[PDB]
Amino acid sequence: YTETVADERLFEQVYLQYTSEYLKGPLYWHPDKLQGWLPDYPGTPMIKEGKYTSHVIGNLKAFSSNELAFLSMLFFGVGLYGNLQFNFYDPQWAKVDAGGFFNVSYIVESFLLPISFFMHIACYIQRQNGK
Amino acid sequence: EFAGGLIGGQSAFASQEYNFDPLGLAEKFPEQLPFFREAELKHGRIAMLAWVGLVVPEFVRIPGPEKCWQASAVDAHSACVXXXXXXXXXXXXXXXXXXXXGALTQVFIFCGTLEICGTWAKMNPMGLTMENAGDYRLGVNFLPDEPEKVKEMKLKELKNGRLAMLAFGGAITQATLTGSGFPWLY
């Protein structure tokens, strides 16, 4: 037997297939495997099965899909109402210009529109995982 | 285990557990349960003192800056702070009053100092957990040495705090609506 180039290539393939599996394990300890680096944080897997895991939505991971859907629609309604009642209907610009003050309810509500967007995103993420 | 095993969730009819949490916040936020109990106990204690000091000034009024130290319990906050510049901002141009400055901001700064070297020092530096939630080790020598006696004393503290919170809310709302004395009735 002499080591043909095909045999060397076979050793290359065997070595790479074994080592690529070994380095993923708890026995390689590379700086690229630290927290904040490539691997997910220990108790908080973000993506599994090609689907956003429940841990993505942070403190909302315990919320039900129905609860998140209700919160999403409610926040959408309230925030859209605030934006429409601040910009087009019931404008506050003239009132505040003459020394008045903003209708604080409108300002608080209008911030619930993007919150509602991300809330409905979280609702879909929860629904995918069956929660 | 309900709410990480905190005191306060047990029913009074016994043989049953009220475990009152209709929104289920204990299971939604188990990592902030110690903070939730810290907030609950702080609200209860502040509300106990608030109800006591909502009743008492109807009888005795410390004689001091007449700008404050006068009026109903409702007109006692915005009067005992005066027309501050924006909010809790001392007027350095005219200290010693002569127009606008606070009279409680001393209470505010004392509360801030105590709170920072109290809750903030308990959480940030080199640690609060489920069991040591409201425990600031203040007057523990008075606490009896018995496993159930401490638990029932803590439960009594919690329930008095909740009652005082609800009572202060009702009392201040009735006083704003009507004025009147201690009954706070129309």
Binding site: Y1, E3, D7, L10, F11, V14, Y15, Q17, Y18, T19, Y22, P26, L27, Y28, W29, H30 | -
Partner: protein, 119 residues
């Protein structure tokens, strides 16, 4: 008068734009002939060797330059690799994992960092 600051200028301007620059140039050309000159960019300086050895003496940075550093249990890794190669060894092949890795680590590049021989 609006002048009277020129008393400072008549000393500072000649100083910092003639005496200091000339002294700096002379000191720089003197420094150019030290054995330590530009030891951070010029290869083969004594101080570079001392700094590298000082880094190697630190317990954390002993095996820092090794590209293969990290294997917590290299014996386990080698045993697993040998087992995996045994099941895939082609027919009556006479190559083992140990000598294969030994000869794959030993290359022939005599002219690599040969500048580590003067300082």
């Amino acid at each position: 008068k609006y002048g009277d600051q020129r008393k400072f200028a008549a000393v500072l301007v000649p100083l910092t734009t003639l005496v200091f620059p000339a002294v700096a140039m002379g000191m720089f050309v003197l420094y150019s002939f030290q054995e330590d000159a530009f030891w951070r960019i010029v290869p083969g300086t004594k101080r570079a060797r001392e700094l590298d050895e000082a880094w190697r003496e630190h317990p954390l940075f002993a095996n820092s330059k090794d590209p293969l550093d990290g294997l917590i249990n290299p014996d386990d890794y080698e045993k697993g690799l040998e087992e995996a190669w045994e099941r895939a060894k082609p027919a009556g092949s006479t190559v083992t994992v140990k000598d294969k890795l030994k000869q794959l680590s030993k290359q022939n590049n005599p002219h690599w960092e040969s500048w580590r021989a003067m300082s």
